[PDB]
């Protein structure tokens, strides 16, 4: 007990965590709000944040898939883990206005 602080024991927990397209297992304390399905909002489904419009989607996901992907590295669809529905994600910005 009475040794130098360099010789005293330290407990180390090396929390190695990976986030994949699998269903989320551990989540933070963030409180789940309601769902807005026609307005440009800031969304955060399972830690995957973004800014867009969520809409009802008819795409089919794998039973363990949480989000889809576009040709670019942008998630165009996300499975809402409460209702288990699939919501299409659309950009808030509309390009083409002159």
């Amino acid at each position: 007990p009475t040794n130098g602080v360099g010789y005293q024991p330290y407990r180390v927990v090396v929390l190695s965590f990976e986030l994949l397209n699998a269903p989320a297992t551990v989540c933070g304390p963030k409180k789940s709000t309601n769902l807005i399905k026609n307005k440009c909002v800031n969304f955060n489904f399972n830690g995957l944040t973004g800014t867009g419009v969520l809409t009802e989607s008819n795409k089919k996901f794998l039973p363990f898939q949480q989000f889809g992907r576009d040709i670019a590295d942008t998630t165009d669809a996300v499975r809402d883990p409460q209702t288990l529905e699939i919501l299409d994600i659309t950009p808030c910005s509309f390009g083409g206005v002159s």
């Binding site: 990976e18 994949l20 397209n21 889809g68 992907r69 040709i71």
Partner: protein, 36 residues
Amino acid sequence: QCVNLTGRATIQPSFTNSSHRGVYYPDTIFRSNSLV
């Protein structure tokens, strides 16, 4: 209880080709409609 096998046949290997087999997923990253 283990028994040293009797009536063995001096095991020797044949050899062939693996063809286009054994492909697996190099990484856990999700990819869709990609070419990497």
